[PDB]
Ligand binder design. Structure first.
Ligand SMILES: N[C@@H](CC(=O)O)C(=O)O
Ligand SMILES: N[C@@H](CC(=O)O)C(=O)O
Ligand SMILES: N[C@@H](CC(=O)O)C(=O)O
Ligand SMILES: N[C@@H](CC(=O)O)C(=O)O
Lengths: 326, 326, 326, 326
């Protein structure tokens, strides 16, 4: 059978206590996760290890770099056929995108979590993990970038987002859709992601060091004032992503603050709070002010790309090109 | 015919220049809006006026109070059968919710905008406005709270959100659905909203003064630090809404900052960045720290309710009760 | 504790064998369903019984009438506080609507199923059933018509449809939305259904006899010919629902066949194959031909209402009025 | 500028009269369509012609073959850079899929329609057509199979379906998502379709003759009986697609009828009425009876593939392989 490395980071998939909720994220080790499925041993040899044991609300760059380094080392090993990472669902979409930009392998990397804790009635993690391992061993899963497998569905990491606080079907791809299906391990792909990933990426771990450039996200709303934006500047942000209203829009006072920050060399990205769709110029002439539009990346994924962009360049045109290509 | 007051605030529905985009939000007056439909004059006498002429990204409390005061005065007039407000789509959902909580009338109040500027190819505002006026005159539109009519659909103000940066069908109700349909003016309702609105609300304009209590919204993501949260505190926020990860979750450092702020009397509301679903206790014991869960309100609508809550009380239990009732 | 009657009909919620699929619909009895939850005994006394043990693809009028008669008798009993019906998901939406039109009680009736068989990894039935019982005991569940509880969500029977072949979140309300949420038994309602149900319905079991009037559903597509439509007529259909293309449209040859059938007294309802939205007149002048538009009912629910309509009247205007009211 | 052939077939995009509905599908010629945009002449030379002038509810094989033959001849011409087809929305998804399987070119073919008639308030056709022409000239639109452009979105023909009776945003890809976006002509692709299309297809016009093999679609519901199925057999159907309940399920009497028909050489495809998801074996052992599962194709697109399959083979395994590959 193929060997799959399983890298556990924590998350509700490993959470425990209760059957009706009542749990901590974060709790059981990477070997109890395997005891509840082992029809698993029919499809892969699993090499499990613990990278961290946290709720993903506590995900940070130290763990991202440990996770990415371990994943890359295993992907480089000819005895490893693919990697599955168990992860809390809250920030899974950010870790997936980060790995999609920094890992260099054609072998499948699949992130998976659970929206119900492992001891819940009707817990969802066992079948999600079976499926995830099924996708990671499938030959057609190679060369598609980092994948997320949840609730019988296969997503590309750039596209997938957590859209609901609690539903088991919370992950969706609101702009471009799921790239495949997996039903009790039967895997089918219907789409190939076109944005640059993994082996095609200019970012790589050997070139990166934590702390990454500081990038904050600023929310907007009626009655908004740029006081938190200015505080971000004062705390030495190198980039700021705005979760703007509608098509990345902001108040006049915000815009003047953004213009001044950009003129000082801070990179300003216009994203949106709305949850889907691309941000475009038009009401704001981005090129007039040096602003970057975040494509159809939501604020947290725009931040991931911006942080990596800023390790390479401060050139606005080049950064806008990265948002067109990644 | 019935008389409908039309209160114009600006927005892309009044934006102009271009046929392929290229426009300012904000631009044409409340009487050109009526020239392009007037089968309108077959269903209502329209009494139009300009309250403001801005893109809704510049919506603020001065305009909210002017708008609400004018709407209430017209609703109190026996010669007015309903009110239509034209508004930019970016913050329409916030203005609608604010009016839903402060206006006291059973007569229909309908907000409407356009996702394409008035001089676009296939501009959407003319039919949206025809429809909006159609809903506002319909007898079944009374006593349902403030309404939003967009793209052939009737929404309750608490439920409706802008979900996409640019699509004409951007407004959706992701938790509870649209309450009715309107197709070339033919109006049908299928649901009655149950949360408290308008005549049942404890908030009213005569009790409110701007500036409302300061409430900021703090975004969260992997690698988050509470530095912007602390800056909000330092700028004298009376309440803070957190756009938390997943089910309103935050990092350990965030949680400790939130706990300290709550113990000092700042009201902390856990909302979510994800876009849909209710925030619940569980991983966070809200009652242990005095935190409020934002129900299924997204961060910007949670902020609207919190600002009004704070004019009445600092009592956490009472504020959580408002989030259960409004 | 309240007493809830549990009426089992079969379905994948009672299906068994396998952990990876491989099961029959239909298989385990109404008392094993209760062994896997019994935190249940903390919220209700359950009086279970088997009405049938079938996959819902074999649901028919004999079982509908047995089910409805038993439900009505239990609802009439002062010792019964509500009723939960376990049911296969395939035709759950039809049974729910039928019961919504024929049962006369204000007490809650809740239908529930499972998309994974009971012995699957991550089977969904235990928590769906816990939730269903939670909703059925809740005082706010009364007087809302028949309910469907699935996947943490509360639906009104008229609105809910199975939209996906296999996902656990397959049930949705595509026109009007879910009316509430239930999360580990915590029940909240946000909407009241407005169409006529249960105690407000003119249909009642004591007036109905099986076989109900024969009503067929005819599908449409490019290259369509009315040969199957004519066969329905030849097999003595009293009504025919057309699953038309787009806004209930049909080919010229279909239309002429429909016109002739209507002139002979067969009642023709224009529904749609598309899955959502109301069917309207316009391209077809329904009143010219005596046709009925099916509102926003999909073909199978339009058929349920039409069958009941035809026990009362052949009057087209009265039947169109039923499609406006139910 | 590039030359784009525009092939008009009719549809609401060419419908006229009325500003509030009231129109015939079908009505204005392929040259008035061009008068209302001509910023068009800035992006392409348009060579327009009328193939037909019908509502798409009257689409049939005579027009499909005329349309396909003309499209292929133009695609074979070195002076033609791409083809846009204007079409009624009702059966657009079927024509698109048929062309995706029979046309052999790498140049873009784009189908487009309008959900509001051309003389409606806020008619959607002008911008949809501008966009469609924009996509058809874009170099990245080549080699992706037949495309559908509607409402600012780019779809692959296999994936796209009309989901709502009347909304302008009715077309969606419920399983795999849109492959790109187009906003006032700015075209971006995020996904490549993987199922076989156009140049990779084994079907081609030179091998096909109308009438194609007869294939009917049979709807299912509670209380179903195979009488219409038997009538299809009696009318010499070569294949039958079942719009089954849930995961392609049917009553016991249906199943026995299906088994007998298959044993006689009629090819039986299990699709679903639900609107999304793949049909799988499991409750029905398809290989036991010779049945074909329709993948995630809805009944009308399953019919298109089945008709073409039947011109090539009667071999069940080979036909199931086509449903795995196309
Ligand atoms: N807070 C949890 C939520 C989950 O995994 O569902 C986490 O992200 O670790
Ligand atoms: N920025 C504009 C967007 C719109 O109306 O569509 C506004 O909200 O005023
Ligand atoms: N065929 C099964 C499907 C299910 O329950 O999920 C039934 O409806 O009984
Ligand atoms: N019945 C029309 C509907 C439309 O185009 O929107 C057609 O398909 O031709």
């Amino acid at each position: 059978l193929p060997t799959i490395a399983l890298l556990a980071t924590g998350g509700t998939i490993a959470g425990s206590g209760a059957s009706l909720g009542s749990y901590k994220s974060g709790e059981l080790g990477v070997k109890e996760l395997l005891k509840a499925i082992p029809s698993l041993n029919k499809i892969a040899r699993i090499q499990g290890e613990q990278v961290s044991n946290i709720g993903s609300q506590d995900m940070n760059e130290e763990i991202w770099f440990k996770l990415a380094q371990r994943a890359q080392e295993l992907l480089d090993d000819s005895r490893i056929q693919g990697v599955v990472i168990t992860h809390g669902t809250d920030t899974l979409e950010e870790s997936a995108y980060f790995l999609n930009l920094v890992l260099h392998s054609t072998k499948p990397v699949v992130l998976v979590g659970a929206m119900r804790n492992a001891s819940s009635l009707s817990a969802d993690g066992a079948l999600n993990l079976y499926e995830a391992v099924s996708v990671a061993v499938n030959e057609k899963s190679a060369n598609k970038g980092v994948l997320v497998v949840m609730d019988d569905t296969i997503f590309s990491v750039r596209e997938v987002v957590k859209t609901h606080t609690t539903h088991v079907s919370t992950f969706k791809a609101l702009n471009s859709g799921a790239i495949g299906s997996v039903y009790y391990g039967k895997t089918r792909y219907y789409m190939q992601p076109l944005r640059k990933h993994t082996t095609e990426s200019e970012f790589s771990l050997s070139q990166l060091k934590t702390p990454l450039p500081k990038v904050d996200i600023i929310y907007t709303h009626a009655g908004m004032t740029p006081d938190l934006f200015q505080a971000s500047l004062n705390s030495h942000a190198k980039g700021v992503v705005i979760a703007g209203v509608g098509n990345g829009n902001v108040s006049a006072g915000f815009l003047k603050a953004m213009q001044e920050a950009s003129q000082m060399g801070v990179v300003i990205v216009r994203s949106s709070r709305v949850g889907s769709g691309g941000v475009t110029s038009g009401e704001i002439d981005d090129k007039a002010y040096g602003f970057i539009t975040s494509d159809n990346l939501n604020p947290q994924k725009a931040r991931v790309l911006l942080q990596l962009a800023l390790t390479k360049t401060n050139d606005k045109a080049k950064i806008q090109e990265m948002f067109e290509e990644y």
